[PDB]
Design a protein around this ligand. Structure first.
Ligand SMILES: C[C@H](N)C(=O)NS(=O)(=O)OC[C@H]1O[C@@H](n2cnc3c(N)ncnc32)[C@H](O)[C@@H]1O
Lengths: 114, 115
């Protein structure tokens, strides 16, 4: 039912988050530890633990996260650009085992991306 | 032209060389010429879309397909300890090629923040 992580609790409305957008299949909310003046997450309501286990049937859902992300970025006034990030596993620095798309902007993002 | 005018269109049409990892009717995965990690490749759509900010609602499946291909290529390249996927948009994102693309980086510990 949204999974056994803190992101599951956020989806179920059991703990608060600053929600930017919601539909029947995803949720966008500001990150609690922001790394840029604007830093939010877009997550599926379906509990996919990590991108490495995403199924072929999840393709449109994953793309939906990116479309919602870019729409939210526009709504939040990120007209100079932004960066989207998905972390996988220990080397990727994945902090919660529920797939999440980071969207960061409001400052120059640098290279390399970590 | 199929693939667009950028250097990535040239790569799609085999007009300039690339080290290709995977190719299908919708996308192409190839190694980055300036790797920022021991493994660093790009997944790009064969349809030209300039940047994620102008992607259309009907591009959802294609965008998701980039991610699925990214994760499959990462597995095939033995990135078993993980990796980071990145899309750069515009000036603040550090985008230098205006053809939508997904970076996949691995083979070392990635740090936070992601730039
Ligand atoms: C460099 C800038 N920070 C950047 O990341 N720009 S980008 O988001 O648009 O990424 C484009 C990527 O395409 C790569 N690239 C450019 N020309 C290439 C070529 N002929 N073959 C393979 N990769 C190429 C660049 O090294 C860069 O990592």
């Amino acid at each position: 039912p949204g999974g056994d992580t803190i992101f599951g609790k956020i989806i179920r409305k059991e703990i608060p988050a600053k929600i930017i957008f919601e539909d029947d299949r995803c949720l966008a909310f500001h990150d609690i530890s922001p790394q840029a003046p604007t830093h939010f997450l877009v997550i599926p309501k379906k509990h996919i633990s990590q991108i490495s286990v995403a199924e072929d049937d999840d393709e449109s859902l994953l793309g939906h996260l990116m479309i919602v992300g870019k729409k939210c970025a526009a709504d939040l006034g990120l007209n100079k650009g932004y960066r989207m990030v998905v972390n996988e596993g220990s080397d990727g620095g994945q902090s919660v085992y529920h797939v999440h798309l980071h969207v960061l902007g409001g400052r120059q993002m640098h290279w390399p991306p970590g």
